[PDB]
Design a protein around this ligand. Structure first.
Ligand SMILES: *[C@H](C)[C@H]1/C(=C/c2[nH]c(/C=C3N=C(/C=C4\NC(=O)C(CC)=C4C)C(C)=C\3CCC(=O)O)c(CCC(=O)O)c2C)NC(=O)[C@@H]1C
Ligand SMILES: *[C@H](C)[C@H]1/C(=C/c2[nH]c(/C=C3N=C(/C=C4\NC(=O)C(CC)=C4C)C(C)=C\3CCC(=O)O)c(CCC(=O)O)c2C)NC(=O)[C@@H]1C
Ligand SMILES: N[C@@H](CCC(=O)O)C(=O)O
Lengths: 381, 377
């Protein structure tokens, strides 16, 4: 007999009333650095393409540089090393001055063997001013989420007491990542429900008037974090012209929406139940029925479209159109990357990248739930 | 630059100060029952043998009975059901009155029915249950247990409720991980505090024989043994074969000189476990007096204090037979357990006898203390 909105709030109040993920990573590296008495302890998180970022860092600035916020390319860690770190779950200790390494299991020991290090990784570590390195794999969903990096500018051997402690801290990071990922999912459930309740109240208050649909559309566009949005309402029983509503736009899509192109698009039909389908601008232009929009239309940098038909079997009543502009992202890399020899400079290199917007799992679900509500509201609930 | 003792206490203070595992399961089931408005929500944890226990429960007592603390046997949940819940991670809903079921993925979210086996139908009817939702609880990609949602009346669960239960299952899984990691850190302190306790008694209390008695009781308490034996091999040419005892009635001075224990205290500092049944079936086996066997020691953890060449002593950690009592939900038959379901789930109390084992934490701890003593004398 308790509402969902009240229930989700109780989950966070009791199970997710903690610190953020970033703040937790920061606490962990500082405790490791003090306990080890080393120059630098970092936490590095892989991206999908194998590259990564330094998310947390405790560092003696007099001894080592700060790599916080810097990105490293995929080639820095070759498949051989990733295999040993992830699938074998090996912590790796590199003794630079003697060009040797050793591996201990992240799991346990129940009881060291030295191996010669490749000359590239030796120069690499030298270029960093590092003579002692301990790489600790961070696991999540049986995958290498990233590493914990312990660096010292002087020769430094680690006792087993220190191995086990870093292995323990690795599980703490894994714990926090799990915590943060679940708290994210709960919060997405709150946003979903808050959108539904807001839409229901809007209709109950205003009814079947343009103010309802204008307010509802931009409420949805804001929840799904789009850059712009359009709600199209088809002619009802015995004809009722056509209604369209816009948010964060500049020109009237009214005439453009009546095009053969958009009538097919809004229904989710190719030829060129509220299942949202994503599109890029470059894909729509390749349609056989593609008709160019006005001049000051394509200059708004709108590149990503999420079109959701307002339908239910033999009943199509309209469509929800969510838009996203091309975004410019800045990444600071450690040295100039963009082969056989390692780079010997790790200075901050700035790069700007025009990324094509994507509609993730949560946003697509949110758009589905939103359009479903819109369908039920249009057919007079 | 920091000691280990200070570090581990900071880890617990900063990451492990919250509700216990038991308290969290009880919070979770109570929120689930109130939210769903059903008669009973339970959390059920599997043992290694396939059986399980109702750890937490929220129940409308005027609608359904209480199963809190009760054990259910392995036969109740057949291999195929464990496969669906575990490796396939299926949430299973049973509509008893129509003898049908539908399955949904624990993580899948964006409706088909199948006939339920007649046995599981009788089973749920015997419980007074007409509507059931079984949600797998995972840990390390293994089926840790289930969350059981039971209603006496027919009840179809909406999509919003499926996701919500799935979310609570992830919450349970999180609390389990936190609990286990909290246990590891605590066992790290026990191992640490043992060492510092010994070292304060080594370089300060001299080489008095009273030290080997205090270290024996300190280690014995840390490993939570019922009795401890420290055997000192003859020193140099021919000193004296000594032995210290803790919580040991009779004197094992004679039995230790036997080739039975002489071979056991030399391996063949890695700890190794033995049950009494193993010793009795040994080709090398000589019986002890009745006064020694009257204490009923069944589990032996022998840790040879040696480094290849030099073998100066051996550590023997002992545990008596344990008696565990189980409250089975209904009386189990002597045979034909997979043939017919029980129709009565009244608490049947059975006492069990078992030989205690030595887990990874205790064997690691026994190894730490043993090496600590080897370098001592
Ligand atoms: C040589 C042309 C190329 C190359 C090869 C290479 N790398 C490794 C091992 C590792 N390199 C890293 C990189 C990092 N360590 C860090 O701390 C950070 C920042 C947080 C980065 C980006 C890691 C983690 C490993 C694995 C663990 C280790 O310490 O070795 C090897 C293997 C070494 C060996 O054989 O012993 C090789 C061959 N590195 C380059 O940059 C070139 C492109
Ligand atoms: C028949 C002779 C034997 C038998 C077989 C059987 N069981 C199932 C399905 C399940 N049975 C359980 C048991 C429990 N449910 C609970 O809620 C609790 C907590 C107190 C227990 C111990 C579970 C979890 C399942 C799986 C999920 C489900 O609801 O189905 C089946 C499969 C049913 C099917 O056809 O799908 C079968 C064949 N059960 C017996 O007890 C007999 C000894
Ligand atoms: N060797 C794999 C990674 C294996 C792992 O994740 O453990 C790679 O380079 O992508």
């Amino acid at each position: 007999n308790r509402s969902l909105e009240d229930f989700l709030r109780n989950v966070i109040n009791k199970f997710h009333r903690a610190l953020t993920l970033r703040e937790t990573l920061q606490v962990i590296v500082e405790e490791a650095r003090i306990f080890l008495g080393v120059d630098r302890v970092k936490i590095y998180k892989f991206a999908s393409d194998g590259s990564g970022e330094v998310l947390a860092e405790a560092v003696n600035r007099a001894a080592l540089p700060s790599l916080l916020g810097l990105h490293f390319p995929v080639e820095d860690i070759p498949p051989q090393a990733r295999e040993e770190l992830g699938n074998q779950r090996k912590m790796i200790a590199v003794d630079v001055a003697h060009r040797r390494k050793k591996s201990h299991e992240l799991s346990g020991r129940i009881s060291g063997h030295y191996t010669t290090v490749d000359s590239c990784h030796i120069q690499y570590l030298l270029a960093m001013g590092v003579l002692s390195s301990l790489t600790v794999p961070v696991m999540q969903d049986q995958q290498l989420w990233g590493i914990m990096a312990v660096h010292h500018s002087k020769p430094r051997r680690f006792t087993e007491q220190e191995w086990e402690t870093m292995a323990l801290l690795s599980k703490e990071v894994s714990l926090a990542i799990t915590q943060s990922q679940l708290s994210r999912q709960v919060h997405q459930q709150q946003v979903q429900e808050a959108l539904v309740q807001r839409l229901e109240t809007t209709v109950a208050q205003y009814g079947d008037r343009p103010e309802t649909w204008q307010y509802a559309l931009e409420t949805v566009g804001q929840a799904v974090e789009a850059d712009g949005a359009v709600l199209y309402i088809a002619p009802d029983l015995t004809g009722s012209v056509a209604q369209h509503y816009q948010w964060n736009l500049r020109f009237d899509w009214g005439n453009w929406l009546e095009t053969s192109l958009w009538q097919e698009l809004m229904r989710g039909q190719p030829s060129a139940n509220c299942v949202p389908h994503g599109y890029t601008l470059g894909e729509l232009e390749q349609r056989s029925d593609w008709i160019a929009p006005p001049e000051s239309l394509s200059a708004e940098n709108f590149q990503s479209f999420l079109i959701v038909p307002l339908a239910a079997d033999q009943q199509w009543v309209g469509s929800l159109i969510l838009l996203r502009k091309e975004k410019s992202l800045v990444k600071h890399w450690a040295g100039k990357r963009g082969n056989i020899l390692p780079r010997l400079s790790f200075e901050a290199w700035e790069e700007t990248q025009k990324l094509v917007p994507t509609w993730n799992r949560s946003e697509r679900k949110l758009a589905q739930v939103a359009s479903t509500q819109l369908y039920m509201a249009i057919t007079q609930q």
